[PDB]
Design a protein around this nucleic acid. Structure first.
Ligand code: ZN
Lengths: 143, 172, 137, 191, 52
RNA sequence: AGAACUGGCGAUGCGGGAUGAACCGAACGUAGAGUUAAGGUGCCGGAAUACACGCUCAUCAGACACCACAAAAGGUGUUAGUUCAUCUAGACAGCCGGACGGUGGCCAUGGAAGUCGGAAUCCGCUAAGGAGUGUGUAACAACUCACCGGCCGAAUGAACUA
RNA sequence: GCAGUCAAGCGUUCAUAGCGACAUUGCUUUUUGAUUCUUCGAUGUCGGCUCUUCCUAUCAUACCGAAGCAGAAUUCGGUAA
């Protein structure tokens, strides 16, 4: 029962780990039972959010290092109050769904995982101008 | 029952034309001399096989010396014993340098705490405990912590003479 | 005053590397090192240099000294020697009053009757020059 | 089983200085200074910094170890008493004869004096302990308030005042008259 | 007479107690054992009885 | 009070059991030297205030066969042990976060919205959150707890034995 | 003769305020028996009077804890001879 219910968790954790390609680790310090409910709705389109006990998660992920191994780099960010938000929709939109909406006095992004990688979500939030000015200043470096 | 040595005792039933070459049985016995050890061998064998020493013989008796008589080990000790009102199994742990050293404190401890004299105890198993923290018992775990140190407060020196011309101190 | 003052008893600790002076037995007189703690009453010691045999000993037949040197716990006799030497333990001991008084007391005890006589005569000489001093300032 | 070491911790707050020598503890803060003899317990103190002092028992059995926390506490309440201070409040409770309570003195002494208890012609006196100071609330009927640096002395002086009104030969569930401790806390830091 | 809250106050002292059944000690109301050595620290306790 | 076998006392001192017919040791010419028995070795008193591991604190401790009595039954005193269960998939404790939507759920009534009370006890979203453990309001608010989490890191709960 | 343990029952309700069956562990030596060790070439019976001392299983008196203690009166219990 108690062994059962834990095992159940690992099950659904694994399932999103295979199904969705990208991953949001969200900090939820404070944050109401109500707030979360409304990020569910706000993302009922694509994203699924999945919360759990850290020691459950570290353990479960580690046992998944045989198949699906880059999740070994997820580990250094499951600490404090955290949860996952899996998605196949793209990047920023979803992040902005998370960060922005149902903020009050919110919940935060702490690191992102996509295709065996590790942003900070500072990266993603990029001005298209550092991308602009680094193909510019180097066509100027060629000129 | 004293300063203990540990012996291999190996014995067997006497040969019959019907069964020459009867099976050999060994016990490890803790005792102080070999007369006790063979006694002890028979006491146990009689409780485990039909044999009295009148139908058997002791084939070999050999002292088993501790292999690493200065490595400190933590031993698991298993014991069966009689109380004034029944009989009990009991697991204890002992930290020491040799089985023979451990067993002797087992006997003092059974005497101190449970008032069990030697006739009343059987040693069931004695075993070095391989991995620290398979150690189960607080009063031995305490010693296993890293960079363990302690003082010995309040030192009393024994005096050689009856009078002393200074008031002593306990300072260590 | 205005700092919190707390004088704390500075006990010699039973610890790996603590050096002890053996009170009793055949190794009576010699230094050995605690290698591993056995319990509140017993320890493994080892005095390769003084030639005291690595053995489990009861703390009551030993006396803790203030000296201690770096020694990994469990260290076998060979590496106890290397370390004891590296540390210059005998050097430190010899320099102590404690070791000096033992030596003094040892030397007195070996004095011949003739020697006892000379110490008398010399003492009487020193005395003399002392009493005239202790009389001038 | 004998615990090879076992220790507790004493936070020293800003502004206070605790100094201990052969178990005689002197604690000094903004409110004043208290001392206490701890010689009757073998414990050893150790100052880590001026914020923090430790107390250990070495190689001690149960009952010894029980002494450890209690030393910590006593020393804690010395520190609290000399920073926040102690305040115990009491209430007179009487069904009929109002309990009439004043301060009186003899040889510059100071007593809490209690009159008319259950209609008694006798007068009750309780010496006011040194260090403890008595007030009477302005806006709670029948209140009485003892305060000072020493919980020990405040609390005992309150106990003395209530024990002196016990009611003898009457069912004490029906006859509930008395002076009872009604609140206890700090001088400084709200109420 | 006597406000409800002071009757309550008085009762923490006078009546919210338990009683040793061997030796009669007035004991703390949530106690498990008698504090007294004469009754063997018995754990045979009962509540002090409430008025009418 | 009365039988069985043996050994004793009686008929027998001696050494020990303080004392003592019968127990323990040992049986007896006059003595010297040595060694022991049973029993002892803080002091009375000849002989270690010897060595070693524990256990015990008694406002009625305890202290040696025969022997100079103590039981049922109890103890959250302290010791060591047993069994069952919880816990590295993170328990227990401590501090700290969350404790939500249908929804003021139907009765009933001056008003009763989780908390006078009758009868029910469902769902959603959950990592979790009772149609509600209490505090509180006139009734809502506010607080609280059950429940889930953060941190910490190896123990925890119960019943028993002697 | 005196005191416990268990707790079915009594006690409007409620085992244990006060009690307490069936059973069961004890204590005492002012009951009475059982025994026949001492004394039958002697140890002067019963009761009272007088007088001293001791025990405590406490009737009164001191201070307490319980209650089916409102008050008064009682009853249970402690330290107490
Ligand atoms: Zn009691």
């Amino acid at each position: 029962g108690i062994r059962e219910k834990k095992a159940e968790y690992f099950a659904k954790l694994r399932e999103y780990l295979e199904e969705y390609k990208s991953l949001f680790v969200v900090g939820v310090d404070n944050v109401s039972s109500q707030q979360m409910h409304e990020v569910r709705k706000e993302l009922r389109g694509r994203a699924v959010v999945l919360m759990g006990k850290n020691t459950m998660v570290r353990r479960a992920i580690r046992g998944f290092l045989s198949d699906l191994p880059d999740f070994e780099k997820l580990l250094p960010f499951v600490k404090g109050n955290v949860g996952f938000v899996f998605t196949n929709e793209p990047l920023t939109e979803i992040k902005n769904v998370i960060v922005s909406n149902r903020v009050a006095a919110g919940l935060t992004v702490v690191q992102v995982y996509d295709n065996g990688q590790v942003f900070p979500s500072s990266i993603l939030d990029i001005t298209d101008e550092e991308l602009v000015s680094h193909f510019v200043s180097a066509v100027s470096t060629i000129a | 029952m004293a300063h203990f040595k540990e012996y291999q005792v190996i014995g067997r039933r006497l040969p019959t034309e019907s069964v020459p070459e009867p099976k050999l049985f060994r016990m490890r016995i803790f005792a102080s001399n070999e007369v006790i050890a063979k006694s002890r061998y028979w006491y146990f064998l009689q409780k485990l096989h039909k044999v009295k020493k009148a139908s058997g013989e002791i084939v070999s008796i050999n002292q088993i010396n501790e292999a690493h008589p200065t490595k400190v080990k933590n031993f698991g000790v298993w014991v069966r014993y009689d109380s004034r009102s029944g009989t009990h199994n009991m697991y204890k742990e002992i930290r020491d340098v040799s089985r023979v050293a451990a067993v002797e404190t087992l006997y003092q401890d059974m005497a101190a705490r449970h008032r069990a004299r030697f006739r009343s105890i059987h040693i069931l198993k004695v075993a070095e405990i391989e991995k620290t923290a398979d150690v189960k018992r607080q009063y031995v775990k305490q010693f296993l912590t890293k960079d363990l140190k302690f003082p010995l407060p309040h030192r009393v020196q024994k005096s050689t003479k009856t009078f002393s011309y200074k008031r002593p101190s306990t300072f260590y | 005053s205005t700092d919190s003052i707390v004088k704390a008893s500075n006990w010699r600790l039973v610890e790996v590397g603590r050096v002890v002076l053996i009170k009793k037995g055949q190794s009576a007189g010699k230094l050995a090192a605690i290698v591993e703690i056995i319990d509140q009453k017993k320890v493994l010691i080892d005095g390769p240099k003084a030639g005291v045999p690595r053995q489990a000993i009861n703390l009551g037949q030993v006396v803790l000294t203030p000296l201690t040197f770096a020694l990994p716990r469990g260290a076998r006799t060979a590496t106890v020697s290397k370390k004891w030497a590296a540390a210059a333990v005998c050097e430190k001991w010899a320099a102590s009053s404690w070791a000096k008084k033992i030596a003094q007391r040892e030397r007195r005890a070996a004095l011949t009757d003739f020697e006892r006589f000379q110490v008398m005569v010399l003492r009487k000489q020193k005395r003399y020059t002392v009493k005239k001093a202790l009389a001038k300032a | 089983m004998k615990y090879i070491q076992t220790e507790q911790q004493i936070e020293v707050p800003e502004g206070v200085t605790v100094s201990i020598k052969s178990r005689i503890v002197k604690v000094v803060g903004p409110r004043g200074t208290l001392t206490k003899n701890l010689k009757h317990i073998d414990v050893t103190f150790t100052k880590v910094n001026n914020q923090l002092i430790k107390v250990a028992v070495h190689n001690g059995g149960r009952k010894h170890v029980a002494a450890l926390r209690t030393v910590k506490s006593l020393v804690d309440n010395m520190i609290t008493g000399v920073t926040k201070g102690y305040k115990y409040k009491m209430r007179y409770v009487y069904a009929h004869f109002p309990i009439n309570v004043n301060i009186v003195e003899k040889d510059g002494a100071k007593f809490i004096e209690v009159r008319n208890f259950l209609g008694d012609k006798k007068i009750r006196n309780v010496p006011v302990r040194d260090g403890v100071t008595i007030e009477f609330s302005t806006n709670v009927k029948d209140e009485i308030v003892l305060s000072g640096n020493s919980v020990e002395d405040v609390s005992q002086n309150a106990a003395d005042l209530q024990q002196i009104c016990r009611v003898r030969n009457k069912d004490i569930r029906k006859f509930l008259d008395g002076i009872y401790v009604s609140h206890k806390g700090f001088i400084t830091e709200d109420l | 007479i006597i406000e409800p809250s002071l009757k309550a106050l008085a009762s923490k002292y006078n009546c919210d107690k338990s009683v040793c059944r061997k030796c009669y000690a007035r004991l703390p109301p949530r106690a498990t054992n008698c504090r007294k050595r004469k009754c063997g620290h018995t754990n045979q306790l009962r509540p002090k009885k409430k008025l009418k």
